[PDB]
């Protein structure tokens, strides 16, 4: 359960969606005023992505 915002900063360098093993979209709620995006990489590292960036919007729109 999301108790506060997870992402203070976001990874800005675009990359190919093939390296994303898990995509997590968290809608704004009582504990965070903004939509947040967390992707999990092959290594298991969790990365914050900017939902306001077009390249991120495209990875979500074509993720299936």
């Amino acid at each position: 359960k999301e108790l506060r915002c997870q992402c203070i900063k976001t990874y800005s360098k675009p990359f190919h969606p093939k390296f994303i093993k898990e995509l997590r979209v968290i809608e704004s709620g009582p504990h965070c005023a903004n939509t947040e995006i967390i992707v999990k990489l092959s290594d298991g590292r969790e990365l914050c992505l900017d939902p306001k960036e077009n390249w991120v919007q495209r990875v979500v729109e074509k993720f299936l």
Partner: antibody, heavy 126, light 108 residues
Framework: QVQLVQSGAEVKKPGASVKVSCKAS????????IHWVRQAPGQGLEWMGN????????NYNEKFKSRVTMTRDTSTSTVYMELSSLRSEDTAVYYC???????????????????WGQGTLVTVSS | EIVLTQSPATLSLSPGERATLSCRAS??????LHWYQQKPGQAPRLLIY???RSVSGIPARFSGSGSGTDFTLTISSLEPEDFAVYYC?????????FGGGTKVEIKR
């Protein structure tokens, strides 16, 4: 010199608005949340909300959401808190405080607020 | 909402004595409980973070511990500058909540 420098004391009339600033220096501005905590005379500490210095996306305490606005200026590493519809009960020392460092790798183990500004006294009086 | 209850409201101790300050959380806050010191006319100052973790520049006499919703700040031996108000503060969830404070005063 790691600092959080706040604007000077303010004297406002009931119903008026106040805008307090907090300028960050000597550290990576974007790595720390900036919280606003107030202390009414002889009382405890009360969280008003915070803001991410990157997004400029602010989180408020439900108690003040209708009357408070938090903004930031990355160019000048300054955070602002605007409190509206002032009443006698808003008379307090308003502090800004930093919590971090954090990056684009999320965590569930947090730091405390390690650096606080000197506080700004806001007096609400006729 | 999260309510942090500090006890006692006032600790009256002599310098050199051990100070034991308690903080009780209404619900679980994991270990995201931090300790602050506040002196008159000054901003609060972080002592211990994440229940028991050490803060740079803070004397070794300060230590924190926590069992579930129960947290403790210990000052092993009170120094004259340690007589102040102490607050516990949670940030496991927003809004951040602070306890009502414990005043550590000189016993005479």
């Amino acid at each position: 010199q790691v600092q959080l420098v706040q604007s000077g004391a303010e004297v406002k009339k009931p119903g008026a608005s106040v805008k307090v600033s907090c300028k960050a220096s000597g550290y990576e501005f974007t790595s720390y949340w900036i919280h606003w905590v107030r202390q009414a005379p002889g009382q405890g500490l009360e969280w008003m909300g915070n803001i991410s210095p990157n997004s400029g996306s602010a989180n408020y305490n439900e108690k003040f959401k209708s009357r408070v606005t938090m903004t930031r200026d990355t160019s000048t590493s300054t955070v602002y808190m605007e409190l509206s519809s002032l009443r006698s009960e808003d008379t307090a020392v308003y502090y800004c405080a930093r919590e971090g460092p954090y990056s684009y790798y999320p965590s569930r183990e947090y730091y405390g607020s390690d650096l606080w500004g000197q506080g700004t006294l806001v007096t609400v009086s006729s | 909402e999260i309510v942090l209850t500090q006890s006692p409201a006032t600790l009256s101790l002599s310098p050199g004595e051990r100070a034991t300050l308690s903080c009780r959380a209404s619900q679980s806050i994991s270990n995201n409980l931090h300790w602050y010191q506040q002196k008159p006319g000054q901003a609060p100052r972080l002592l211990i973070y994440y229940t028991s973790r050490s803060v740079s520049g803070i004397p070794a006499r300060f230590s924190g511990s926590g069992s579930g919703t129960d947290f403790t700040l210990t000052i092993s031996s009170l120094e004259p500058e340690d007589f102040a108000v102490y607050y516990c503060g949670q940030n496991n969830e927003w809004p951040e909540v602070f306890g009502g404070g414990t005043k550590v005063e000189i016993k005479r």
